[PDB]
Amino acid sequence: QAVVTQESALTTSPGETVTLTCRSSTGAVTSSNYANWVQEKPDHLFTGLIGGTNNRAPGVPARFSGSLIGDKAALTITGAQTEDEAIYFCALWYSNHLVFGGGTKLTVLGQPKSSPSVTLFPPSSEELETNKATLVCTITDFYPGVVTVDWKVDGTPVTQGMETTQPSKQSNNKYMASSYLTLTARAWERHSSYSCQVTHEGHTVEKSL
Amino acid sequence: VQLQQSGAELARPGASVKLSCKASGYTSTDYYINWVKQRTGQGLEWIGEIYPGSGNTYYNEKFKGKATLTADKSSSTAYMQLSSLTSEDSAVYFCTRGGVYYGYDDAWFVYWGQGTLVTVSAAKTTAPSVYPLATLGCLVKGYFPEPVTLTWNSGSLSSGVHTFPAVLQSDLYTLSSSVTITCNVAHPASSTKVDKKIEPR
Numbered sequence: 427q428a429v430v431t432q433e434s435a436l437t438t439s440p441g442e443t444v445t446l447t448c449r450s451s452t453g454a455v456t457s458s459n460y461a462n463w464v465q466e467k468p469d470h471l472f473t474g475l476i477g478g479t480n481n482r483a484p485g486v487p488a489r490f491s492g493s494l495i496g497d498k499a500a501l502t503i504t505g506a507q508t509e510d511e512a513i514y515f516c517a518l519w520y521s522n523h524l525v526f527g528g529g530t531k532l533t534v535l536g537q538p539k540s541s542p543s544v545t546l547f548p549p550s551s552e553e554l555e556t557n558k559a560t561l562v563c564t565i566t567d568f569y570p571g572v573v574t575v576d577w578k579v580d581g582t583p584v585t586q587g588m589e590t591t592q593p594s595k596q597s598n599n600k601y602m603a604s605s606y607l608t609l610t611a612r613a614w615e616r617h618s619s620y621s622c623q624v625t626h627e628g629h630t631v632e633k634s635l
Numbered sequence: 636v637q638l639q640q641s642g643a644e645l646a647r648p649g650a651s652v653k654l655s656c657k658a659s660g661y662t663s664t665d666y667y668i669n670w671v672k673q674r675t676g677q678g679l680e681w682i683g684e685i686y687p688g689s690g691n692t693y694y695n696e697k698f699k700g701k702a703t704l705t706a707d708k709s710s711s712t713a714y715m716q717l718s719s720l721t722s723e724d725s726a727v728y729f730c731t732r733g734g735v736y737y738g739y740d741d742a743w744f745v746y747w748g749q750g751t752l753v754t755v756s757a758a759k760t761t762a763p764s765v766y767p768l769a770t771l772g773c774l775v776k777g778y779f780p781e782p783v784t785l786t787w788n789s790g791s792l793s794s795g796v797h798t799f800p801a802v803l804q805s806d807l808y809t810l811s812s813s814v815t816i817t818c819n820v821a822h823p824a825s826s827t828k829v830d831k832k833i834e835p836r
């Protein structure tokens with residue numbers, strides 16, 4: 427089908443105005459796409475915000491408004507509040523079927539930016555005695571809670587055997603995540619260096635063994 | 636309006652399970668039920684639509700043959716049969732409804748059920764291997780099912796500790812924790828409770 431594209435993440439501050447966008451892979455977003463918006467708050471609390479491009483649903487605050495901007499649909503929050511921190515999904519109708527966008531995580535800032543604290547652990551002796559080797563990359567104290575992880579072996583980019591957790595909130599309202607690189611014992615011995623690289627707010631923090 | 640969904644479900648690959656969503660309130664109108672899929676590592680995905688009063692349906696091409704939507708007017712209930720289950724079918728499935736006497740151009744996702752969790756696995760109960768990490772840490776690898784519990788030095792060590800969510804490696808779950816010296820791991824499903832201390836290399 428068509429593919430619907432949203433920002434992966436966006437940042438705003440209390441009282442600011444932020445616009446979220448929702449693009450269609452087929453061309454301009456038309457009024458015949460009848461653009462919907464859905465807000466997801468923690469614990470699967472969903473609220474239908476917008477129908478028919480710009481009809482705000484009963485009960486939804488007036489600061490929410492939908493519209494078309496150029497060739498795409500959009501959701502504008504005029505005077506963002508703390509409670510507006512959520513994931514916003516858009517959805518487009520293509521005559522006989524519906525497609526959701528990937529969603530946009532909206533952070534409403536409540537503390538200064540914080541870069542990820544990164545630690546990388548080697549496989550233990552006892553794990554190697556099963557002829558397996560797991561490299562553990564712990565990532566903590568970053569804000570906003572959005573990170574990309576990339577691994578390397580002797581400088582070359584790794585493409586297989588990586589598992590990474592969704593960023594989860596800390597008690598100090600910063601975020602944490604973990605990434606695991608799973609190998610055989612021999613494969614870990616073959617190489618001189620392994621590295622975990624975290625991308626956050628346009629900057630990379632990296633650790634190597 | 637209320638949408639009551641069926642209970643959580645556990646299945647083996649290739650099997651089939653049937654979910655249900657009972658609507659309450661203003662069911663004299665003919666209304667749409669939209670089904671939605673959300674995996675733990677994904678956003679929302681539209682499965683299809685069904686009107687329980689008129690039986691009409693709209694489908695997502697990707698789910699034709701995977702999901703079948705049916706309904707019955709008098710009980711105000713919609714069903715979704717999921718066939719030939721796989722790991723990608725593990726998700727929370729939501730049913731949704733439009734507003735009462737709303738327009739077609741109003742928001743379609745007004746009322747939401749509590750969601751039905753579907754987990755597809757061939758894994759038998761497996762106790763976690765626990766490994767020291769050297770800030771220091773504790774690696775909890777290869778258990779099933781969730782959950783596990785982890786503390787540090789019987790719970791006397793709590794500040795400066797980060798315990799990360801579980802992840803699925805090789806059809807089993809793997810977890811980790813770290814501290815700025817021993818970790819206590821409990822896997823009730825395997826009736827296990829292991830302790831491991833970090834002797835330096």
Ligand SMILES: COc1ccc2c3c1O[C@H]1C(=O)CC[C@@]4(O)[C@@H](C2)N(C)CC[C@]314
Pocket residue numbers: 460519667669684693739740743
């Ligand atoms: C312009 O009208 C519409 C545009 C888009 C959709 C609909 C419209 O009217 C309804 C219709 O005819 C059948 C399809 C569908 O049930 C569906 C999608 N749902 C989600 C909402 C209601 C409705």
